[PDB]
Amino acid sequence: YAQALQSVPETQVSQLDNGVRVASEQSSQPTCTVGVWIDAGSRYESEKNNGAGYFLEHLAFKGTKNRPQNALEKEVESMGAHLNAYSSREHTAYYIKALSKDVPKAVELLADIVQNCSLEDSQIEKERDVIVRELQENDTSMREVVFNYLHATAFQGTGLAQSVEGPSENIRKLSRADLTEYLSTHYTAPRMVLAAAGGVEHQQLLELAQKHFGGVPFTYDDDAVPTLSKCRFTGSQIRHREDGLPLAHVAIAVEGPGWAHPDLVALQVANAIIGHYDRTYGGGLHSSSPLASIAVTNKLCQSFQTFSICYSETGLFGFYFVCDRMSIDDMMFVLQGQWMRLCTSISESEVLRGKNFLRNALVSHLDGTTPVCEDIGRELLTYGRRIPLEEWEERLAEVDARMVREVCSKYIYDQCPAVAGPGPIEQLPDYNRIRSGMFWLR
Amino acid sequence: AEPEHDHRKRMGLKMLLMMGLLVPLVYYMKRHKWSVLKSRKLAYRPPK
């Protein structure tokens, strides 16, 4: 096993005199996947600039000037490659997955987008009303709105608080320009990463990137990556009630450390211990995760999940559950209680499993090519380099009970959390109450 | 008629210094706790 980790192929990385960092992992695999992961997002958007990164993602495929729509797609389809991607708050990417026999072809394609997007003013005015609809859809996904609102209040006033999607008013008025104003501003090599995994031979990649990414940095600026304005965490709540809904969602959380921080490990292990439930499972007998157990015994929630969504310099360590208009309270109580237990009297026998549970997701986090690239894509971008499963291993193969306690308490005990809840929540008690739920009557 | 006199006023003294000290304290506490509401803000957002 440990030998399995060790025998795992190191990841190659080397940047350009340009700025791009080119890394990737090699295997036997005929197939592969490759992508450019920009340090771009919504967080990087303004009050009138909010949306672009998206409105963008949405035209990032409809063509380039070199090869308009019908052709790009036709060139992509025709070769059997899958060009997919996203755009978060501090992370955007565009990956393709071909047969490795296309590294140089995929790579070019990549470059031709991140650099030259048609942005056909006529293509835009359509994607405009497309998003405005696609947004109206994102909307009844209470499973999400509940998170944005969480951000909305959790980081109220700052850049994170703005949703990756952006207000309707902006998407209704973004200019042919503003998009380009976004592209040319953030889409730069120093903040972009060319990563891939499959059967590829690094050098061949390099040269192709080093070949299609003929970027040239004059000024000292161009070679420098701006650090972002710190976002003020604001223990508070935001309630979008509506007893008209099947059920209510609740999401509460404390400020997260930020990728960098070594504790995100022990912390990650934390979330391992209470994990998540979801009525389909098969376990009123579940592992320690009482939140799970108790969730069953007393039919607390339809589903609950723990999360340590983190960013560059901040984060959101919490939990989110969905429950009938009626059992909302008992749930919080039982749940929030767990946090306490967690960082007041957690045991070794517990952390033991936690770890292994993480070590399982730790591994399965890297299941295939696309996913591997993700980490590489990410790793570098947010951490600085690539964290080997051999490393993560030790990182979290050395977290003892007393360490979890010391950690969670450090970020949960008597901290002012941010709660978010849409739906028939008449039953969720005020703040003070869920607030004094942060300290255990030890 | 009332030997307690002194003992009774001295007492009164202290009693007055506690009110002085205690009531504000709990006043903060009362406000501290209500701010959640005093602060608060509504908004009606139907779909149209």
Curated annotation (Swiss-Prot), chain A:
Modified positions (N6-acetyllysine) in chain numbering: K74, K101, K126, K211
Topology of the protein relative to the lipid bilayer: Peripheral membrane protein
Modified-residue entries (N6-succinyllysine), positions: K126
Tagged with keyword Glycoprotein: no
Highest taxon in the source lineage: Eukaryota
InterPro entries (alphabetical): Metalloenz_LuxS/M16 (IPR011249), MPP/UQCRC_Complex (IPR050361), Pept_M16_N (IPR011765), Peptidase_M16_C (IPR007863)
GO molecular function annotation: metal ion binding
Modified residues (Phosphoserine): S175
The family this protein is said to belong to: Belongs to the peptidase M16 family. UQCRC1/QCR1 subfamily.
Function (record text): Component of the ubiquinol-cytochrome c oxidoreductase, a multisubunit transmembrane complex that is part of the mitochondrial electron transport chain which drives oxidative phosphorylation.
Record note on quaternary structure: Component of the ubiquinol-cytochrome c oxidoreductase (cytochrome b-c1 complex, complex III, CIII), a multisubunit enzyme composed of 11 subunits. The complex is composed of 3 respiratory subunits cytochrome b, cytochrome c1 and Rieske protein UQCRFS1, 2 core protein subunits UQCRC1/QCR1 and UQCRC2/QCR2, and 6 low-molecular weight protein subunits UQCRH/QCR6, UQCRB/QCR7, UQCRQ/QCR8, UQCR10/QCR9, UQCR11/QCR10 and subunit 9, the cleavage product of Rieske protein UQCRFS1.
Protein name: Cytochrome b-c1 complex subunit 1, mitochondrial
UniProtKB/Swiss-Prot annotation, chain B:
Subcellular location: Mitochondrion inner membrane
Regions that span the bilayer: 5-38
Domain of life: Eukaryota
Mitochondrial matrix side: 39-48
Family, similarity comment: Belongs to the cytochrome c family.
Assembly notes: Component of the ubiquinol-cytochrome c oxidoreductase (cytochrome b-c1 complex, complex III, CIII), a multisubunit enzyme composed of 11 subunits. The complex is composed of 3 respiratory subunits cytochrome b, cytochrome c1 and Rieske protein UQCRFS1, 2 core protein subunits UQCRC1/QCR1 and UQCRC2/QCR2, and 6 low-molecular weight protein subunits UQCRH/QCR6, UQCRB/QCR7, UQCRQ/QCR8, UQCR10/QCR9, UQCR11/QCR10 and subunit 9, the cleavage product of Rieske protein UQCRFS1.
Role played: Component of the ubiquinol-cytochrome c oxidoreductase, a multisubunit transmembrane complex that is part of the mitochondrial electron transport chain which drives oxidative phosphorylation.
Protein name: Cytochrome c1, heme protein, mitochondrial
Natural source organism: Bos taurus
Lineage, opening ranks: Eukaryota, Metazoa, Chordata, Craniata, Vertebrata
